[PDB]
Amino acid sequence: HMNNALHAFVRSPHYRTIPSAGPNGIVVNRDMLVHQFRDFYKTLQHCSLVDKVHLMSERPSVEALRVADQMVSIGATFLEMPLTGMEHRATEFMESMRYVRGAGGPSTLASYLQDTENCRCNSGDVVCLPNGIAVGHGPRTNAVAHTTLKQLFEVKDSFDVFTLEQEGDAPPLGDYFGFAGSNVLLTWKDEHGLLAVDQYQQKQPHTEMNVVYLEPGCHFLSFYGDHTIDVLVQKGYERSMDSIAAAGLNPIPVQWSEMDKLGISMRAAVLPLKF
């Protein structure tokens, strides 16, 4: 066991402003929610995924829990997202950057995507792979972003940038499509994961991939980068947990019902910074 130098920033929920119901109308239990987040923070603390967990101060909007939206880390680059859809979150991202700097992190973030005209990109649509990234193309991440990410990182000699075309109702790619261990592909069993898997296996047909089919809705957390086998799995998805352990991985159950109902994946609630 060795320390991966990965730092995870999260923001605790503001109890007073937790909505009573999620975007679809299902009931949300704020007492359960703050319970689950404290347990989630403690789970991140003792596992192989991250090294150090940093808690950030409360803000009066449940959107501020989506700390992953601010940036994505590709290699040693901390790539800022364009603010075209989230101008109202500038002051939040700001405050988050003070926590990053205070922990010994970067002084600034790379502004390539912010300096590129008409570039739309969502951090969840970028998924880190063995020697490259898979980027979803669809309702959040447009083709300029794919063009820009390729010139930023693609190396044909190798670092691949796979474009995976998404349907209009696809969630961010990383919510249902991920990597674990050395060569394990994690994907949801719905139209979105199955399409992404069909596309990715054609673009990379040379290294055979162990595809693990999770149940649709099974929130999971695993970022490739030591090939640790720890994968956070939403508590309640029994068969998914079986599928993950059937592939030599370590499924770690996390109670996530209330953040699930809020529309916030575990991935969205953790800002992982590859120091």
Residue numbers in the entry: 6 to 162, 166 to 233, 235 to 284
What does the paper say about this structure?
Kinetoplastid protists such as Trypanosoma brucei undergo an unusual process of mitochondrial uridine (U) insertion and deletion editing termed kinetoplastid RNA editing (kRNA editing). However, gRNA directed, processive editing requires the RNA editing substrate binding complex (RESC), which is comprised of 6 core proteins, RESC1-RESC6. RESC5 is a key core component in forming the foundation of the RESC complex. Similar knockdown studies revealed essential roles for RESC5 (formerly called MRB11870) in kRNA editing; cells depleted of RESC5 exhibited 80–90% decrease in edited mRNAs and 2–4 fold increases in pre-edited mRNAs.
We describe here the 1.95 Å structure of the T. brucei RESC5 protein, which represents the first report of an RESC protein structure. Size exclusion chromatography (SEC) studies revealed a clear, single peak for the purified RESC5 protein with an estimated molecular weight (MW) of 30 kDa, consistent with a monomeric form of the protein (which has a predicted MW of 32 kDa). There are two RESC5 subunits in the crystallographic asymmetric unit (ASU). The two monomers in the ASU superimpose with a root mean square deviation of 0.6 Å for 274 Cα atoms indicating they adopt the same structure. The only differences are in two surface exposed loops (residues 18–34 and 159–167), which appear flexible. The RESC5 structure is composed of one domain and harbors a propeller-like fold comprised of 13 β-strands and 10 helices. In the structure there are five similar modular “blades” with each containing a two or three-stranded β-sheet packed against an α-helix. DALI searches revealed the RESC5 structure shows the most significant structural similarity to proteins belonging to the superfamily of arginine-glycine amidotransferases (3.75.10.10), with the strongest homology to dimethylarginine dimethylaminohydrolases (DDAH) of this superfamily. Examination of the superimposition of RESC5 onto DDAH revealed that the catalytic cysteine and histidine are not conserved in RESC5 and are replaced by alanine and proline residues, respectively. Interestingly, the largest patch corresponds to the location of the active site in DDAH enzymes suggesting this pocket might be involved in RNA binding.
